[PDB]
Amino acid sequence: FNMXQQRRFYXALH
Amino acid sequence: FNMXQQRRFYXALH
Amino acid sequence: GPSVFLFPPKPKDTLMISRTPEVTCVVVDVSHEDPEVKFNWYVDGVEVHNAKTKPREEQYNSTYRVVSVLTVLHQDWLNGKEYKCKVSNKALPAPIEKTISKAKGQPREPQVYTLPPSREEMTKNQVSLTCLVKGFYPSDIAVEWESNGQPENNYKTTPPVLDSDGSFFLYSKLTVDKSRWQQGNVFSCSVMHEALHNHYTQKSLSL
Amino acid sequence: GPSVFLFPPKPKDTLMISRTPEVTCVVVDVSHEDPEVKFNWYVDGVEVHNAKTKPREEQYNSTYRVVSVLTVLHQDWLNGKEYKCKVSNKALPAPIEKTISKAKGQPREPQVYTLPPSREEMTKNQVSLTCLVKGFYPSDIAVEWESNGQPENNYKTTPPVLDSDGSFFLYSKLTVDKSRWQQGNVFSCSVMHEALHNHYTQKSLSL
Ligand SMILES: *[C@@H]1O[C@H](CO)[C@@H](O[C@@H]2O[C@H](CO)[C@@H](O[C@@H]3O[C@H](CO[C@H]4O[C@H](CO)[C@@H](O)[C@H](O)[C@@H]4O[C@@H]4O[C@H](CO)[C@@H](O[C@@H]5O[C@H](CO)[C@H](O)[C@H](O)[C@H]5O)[C@H](O)[C@H]4NC(C)=O)[C@@H](O)[C@H](O[C@H]4O[C@H](CO)[C@@H](O)[C@H](O)[C@@H]4O)[C@@H]3O)[C@H](O)[C@H]2NC(C)=O)[C@H](O)[C@H]1NC(C)=O
Ligand SMILES: *[C@@H]1O[C@H](CO)[C@@H](O[C@@H]2O[C@H](CO)[C@@H](O[C@@H]3O[C@H](CO[C@H]4O[C@H](CO)[C@@H](O)[C@H](O)[C@@H]4O[C@@H]4O[C@H](CO)[C@@H](O[C@@H]5O[C@H](CO)[C@H](O)[C@H](O)[C@H]5O)[C@H](O)[C@H]4NC(C)=O)[C@@H](O)[C@H](O[C@H]4O[C@H](CO)[C@@H](O)[C@H](O)[C@@H]4O)[C@@H]3O)[C@H](O)[C@H]2NC(C)=O)[C@H](O)[C@H]1NC(C)=O
């Protein structure tokens, strides 16, 4: 999977 | 547990 | 009458933005004579209309089974919204209703430890690589293995087990040809859970 | 009407001659108004009269629960005899009947491997000692831990997990103060199963 997209998702979750 | 009784049990099972 | 069961998304699918999480409503014991079933879906009380209902399917016991699937948002499921499936069929007195949401309780972060195969297992052609995952809450978790960029599929994982402090642990077992272990190939256990940073962590294991 | 559930002996109790194995018949959803329940027991069709029936007990949901216990012979249970419990109560149309016996299938011997705690777990005050048990059939098994002659109780064991060849594996986790591991104390994982010699094997684990 795309790690940079996962990181952006987690940072933006709220 | 008693190991010698367990061994006798297993040897005599039939 | 028919019976309704309502199923959550796979843990991984809720945690990883590459995936699409879905909630699944299964209607069983639907009779040959009346097999018409309607579904209605709601999120925190508000009706939603994006569900996709499958065509009915007969069973090997003369009855039907009908399945509806709802795609949900990761963040919604993770932030505790509630999902309700309502099922309608003539052979019911009234519609059956079922609701689900993410397990509740204070989250705790998994600790992940890799354990090499025992010396005594080397008499064998295949060996066991172990990943211990402990101290996590809630029990929803996903565990995978890789090597050299690519997934390894020859693993089995125990269910989560309640530990003495009320947290959970499990073990995952990857079975590999002894060759590959002894050649020095690098393996990794990857763990996905809500209380990890990025929802993801990976630990290596090698000779 | 009432409902009847019938339970096998604990694996250890069937395997170890120091123990007394018993089969347990539980009757639930017995009403306040008619709580009289009779039990009859049979072994390979032949009635036996050594069961001991408990006094009825009320539940927190207005209903009763009645339990009968039958002591059985180790060798009989192990050699595949069948145990039948018949339950009688006025609120039934007819007596309910339930039968059990040892899981069937070709037995295979467990392989037992001990795994020390990870280096990365040493930052902690307590550490995890692991026992991997694999390749066994049927799934009925017991696992314990000792040290210096005496039982260690601070362990948890996963359920048996089906492996890719149709055999079973599990892992047991003993949690110990890091002190004791580092002092060089010797621990053992003990495993009881029908397909082991003596029904018993023990593997050591230490620094
Ligand atoms: C006539 O024949 C029919 C059909 O053969 C029978 O129907 C069965 O009736 C049973 C009794 O009424 C019913 O039992 C309940 O089971 C559930 C658990 O069901 C799951 O696990 C089973 C395997 O152990 C499977 O058979 C089921 O299919 C089900 O599997 C899950 O399905 C999910 C939906 O697809 C799926 O999740 C989705 O998957 C997709 C991708 O595949 C996506 O990821 C998506 O995101 C997900 O949402 C799961 O992965 C999948 N899981 C699997 C395969 O493991 C159980 O919870 C329930 O428990 C109730 O009762 C207990 C007992 O007291 C109580 O403790 C509980 O609280 C609860 O109230 C029941 O035991 C069977 O499920 C059902 N068969 C079906 C649905 O196929 C009829 O009964 C027969 N008629 C008779 C006898 O008269
Ligand atoms: C009103 O209130 C009563 C009582 O509170 C309710 O009664 C309950 O009804 C349930 C539904 O009818 C019923 O569900 C079934 O459960 C069994 C599994 O039960 C075991 O595990 C449960 C915990 O998960 C326990 O609650 C049970 O007590 C039971 O525990 C076991 O008990 C054994 C006998 O003592 C014991 O073995 C012995 O132990 C001694 C020493 O202690 C010796 O070693 C001896 O050798 C042994 O023989 C076990 O150790 C012990 N195990 C434990 C504690 O884990 C389940 O199998 C069954 O499944 C049926 O249905 C499913 C679902 O589809 C199907 O898949 C299966 O094929 C099967 O047909 C049921 O789910 C509850 O058990 C029961 N409660 C009881 C008995 O206390 C009423 O229902 C309520 N009224 C209502 C709601 O109207």
Q: How far apart are CA D58 and CA D98, in angstroms?
A: 23
Cβ contacts of A2 on chain C, cutoff 8 Å: 18
C3 close to ligand 1 (CB < 6 Angstrom) = yes
Q: Residue D76, exposed/middle/buried by CB under 10 A (0-12, 13-18, 19+)? A: middle
Nearest chain C CA: its distance from D26 CA (Å)? 26
Contact between B6 and D197 using a beta-carbon 8 Å cutoff: no
Strands D200-205 and C168-177: unpaired
Number of helices and strands (H, E) in chain A?
A: 1, 0
CB contact under 8 A, D75 and B14: yes
CA of D59 to the centre of ligand 1 (A): 29
Long-range contacts at C158-165 (CB < 8 A, ≥ 24 apart): C158/D158, C158/D159, C158/D161, C158/D170, C158/D171, C159/D158, C159/D159, C159/D161, C160/C136, C161/D156, C161/D157, C161/D158, C161/D159, C162/D156, C163/C134, C163/C135, C163/D156, C164/D154, C164/D156, C164/D175
> Are chains A and B touching, using the cut-off of 8 Å on CB pairs and a minimum of 3 such pairs?
no
Q: Encoding tokens for residue C90?
A: 């003539």
- DSSP-assigned letter for residue D199: G
Residue C127 has which token pair? 């060996």
Name the residue with the closest Cα to ligand 2, atom 75. Answer: D28
Min Cα distance D78 → chain B (Å) is: 9
Q: What's the CA gap between C200 and C189, in Å, rounded?
A: 11
Q: Which residues contact B6 (CB under 8 A, 6 or more apart)?
A: D16, D17, D18, D198, D199, D200
User: Pocket around ligand 2: residues whose beta carbon is below 6 Å from it?
Assistant: D 3, 5, 7, 9-10, 13, 22-24, 26, 28-29, 59, 61, 63, 65
Residue type, C160: P
Please name the residue of chain A whose CA is at the shortest distance from the CA of residue C200: A6
- In this complex, is the C-beta atom of C7 within 8 Å of any C-beta atom belonging to chain D? no
**Is residue D111 helix, strand or coil?**
strand
Give the list of residues 6+ apart from residue D205 with CB closer than 8 angstroms, or none.
D114, D115, D116, D129, D131, D186, D187, D188, D189
C150 Cβ contact partners less than 8 Å away, ≥ 6 residues apart: none
User: What is the C-alpha to C-alpha distance for residues C179 and C23, in angstroms, rounded to an integer?
Assistant: 42
CB contact under 8 A, C132 and D134: no
User: Can you read off the two tokens belonging to residue C169?
Assistant: 């642990």
Tokens of D148: 């210096």
What is the distance between the alpha carbons of residues C71 and C41, in angstroms, rounded to a whole number? 11
D82 is in an annotated binding site: yes
Measured between beta carbons, the chain D residues lying within 8 angstroms of B2 are: 18
DSSP assignments along D69-89, one per residue: EEE--HHHHHTT--EEEEEE-
Question: Which of C17, C79, C197 comes nearest A9 by C-beta?
Answer: C17
Closest to C109 (Cα-Cα) out of C133, C130, C132, C131: C133
Q: Identify the residue whose C-alpha is closest to ligand 2 atom 60.
A: D5
| Domains of chain D, CATH where assigned | 2-101 (2.60.40.10), 102-207 (2.60.40.10)
Q: What is the residue whose two structure tokens read 């294991």?
A: C205
Ligand 1 lined by C62 (C-beta under 6 Å): no
Which amino acid is residue D22, in one-letter code? Answer: E
| Method by which the model was determined | X-ray
Residue with CA nearest ligand 2 atom 74: D5
> Residue C5 C-alpha to ligand 1 middle, in angstroms?
7
> For residues D47 and D41, is the Cβ–Cβ distance under 8 A?
yes
For the four alpha carbons of D15, C127, C170 and C81, in that order, the dihedral sign comes to negative
Nearest-CA distance D105 → chain B (Å): 19
Chain centre to alpha carbon of residue D43: 21
Q: Are strands D38-43 and D83-88 parallel, antiparallel or unpaired?
A: antiparallel
Is B6 close to D17, i.e. CB distance below 8 A? Answer: yes
Nearest CA in chain C to D160: C158
Smallest Cβ–Cβ distance between D171 and the set C114, C171, C203 belongs to C171
Q: Is C11 helix (H, G, I), strand (E, B) or coil?
A: helix
CA distances, C10 to each of A1, A4, C70, C168, C191 (Å): 17, 22, 13, 18, 14
Q: Under DSSP, is residue B1 helix (H, G, I), strand (E, B) or coil?
A: coil
A 10 A CB-CB count for C193 gives 25
Does D49 show up as a binding residue in the annotation? no
Across-strand partners of C70? C23
Long-range contacts, stretch C34-38, CB < 8 angstroms, 24+ apart:
C34/C89, C34/C90, C34/C91, C35/C64, C35/C66, C36/C89, C36/C90, C37/C2, C37/C66, C37/C87, C37/C88, C37/C89, C38/C87, C38/C88, C38/C89
